[PDB]
Amino acid sequence: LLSQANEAFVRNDLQVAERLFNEVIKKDARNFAAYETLGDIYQLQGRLNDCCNSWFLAAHLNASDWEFWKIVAILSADLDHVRQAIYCFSRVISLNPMEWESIYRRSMLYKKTGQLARALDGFQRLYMYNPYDANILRELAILYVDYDRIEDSIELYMKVFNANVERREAILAALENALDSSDEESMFPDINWKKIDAKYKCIPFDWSSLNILAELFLKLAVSEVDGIKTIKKCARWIQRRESQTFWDHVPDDSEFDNRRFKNSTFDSLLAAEKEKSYNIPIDIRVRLGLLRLNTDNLVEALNHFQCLYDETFSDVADLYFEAATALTRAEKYKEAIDFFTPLLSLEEWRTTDVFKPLARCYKEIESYETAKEFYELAIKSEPDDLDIRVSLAEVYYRLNDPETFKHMLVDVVEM
């Protein structure tokens, strides 16, 4: 009777006679080739769900054949069948705890679902077994952030930083010893560098990594000074100025600014250490501004923000906003308005997000006449918020027009 399998499968190669497999399955489902082929066939006929189904049940008779369960998993995943994918993957990993694609996708799906721990175990294991992959680091860091565990997330990057430092020092020491020792002779030591490149194979620590680190430091909001110091240090290891230790002992944030010219130890340096990159990317400077703002150091923060004017506006309109908001949150309105106002130039930024805080800023300054405007613009584009109406209502009260104020409140209380 089994022959009917073979007779069919070969003769079903072309067309719908394949759906006569469905007669072969009825007598006994336990045969694999039937389901597997049925899946192979549905995969070809175009219909995906029936296929995925066939493959799933197919998978269940060769339990521990995880190379198949993986396929079922990814297929289920692409079909937006999450729990199926997670389940199949989970078994694939239960059987083979060293399939990183599966663990990755599964952990991503866990991250999606909300089971952050289950994802975190995976990403931990993944990073552990592959510390030279930036995306894994990013994701694991993000997970650590979502877990209110920023410290680990920061240590994660500081490790990479220190690794880069070690690498640099190793290279320099190597070529130094080689060069100096050689120069005593005429030749040059046959020294191995692949050993150097391997033994010190860190993830490259560039400005992006530092920006991420900065963001992580902002998200921390605890002992921001140490953060700023670290940012400056790493930013100073970049630009190859780590030799300059004294910058660690100045709070002025004098470096990365012209003020450095007024420093005593600086002027004493050789022009070789000078003429080096002292300028940082704006993406980081702003964050230093914010991190400075966190410490009620408005002066430096503003000195950092003031560098936004020099940059081409459109390329950093996103940062003006952040800078503007942080100032409102910092009860610094007179300064916030200066960074809110330029956004009005671009149409895309004419939204409530910019109109509320502006209005509040002008409200708090006791220049209500101009706050009224933006509150009206905020409500206009677009309705509605209770609090905004109440704010505008403040404006009307403090404008000695409580009648209107009240009528507004009573107008909005209804809906």
Residue numbers in the entry: 131 to 316, 337 to 565
Report text from the authors:
Recruitment of Pol III to these genes requires the essential transcription factors TFIIIB and TFIIIC2. The six subunits of yeast TFIIIC are partitioned into two DNA-binding subcomplexes (τA and τB). The binding of these intragenic promoters by TFIIIC permits the assembly of TFIIIB, upstream of the transcription start site, which subsequently leads to the recruitment of Pol III, the formation of a PIC and finally to transcription. A genetic study suggests that the two largest TFIIIC subunits, τ138 and τ131, are responsible for connecting τA and τB16.
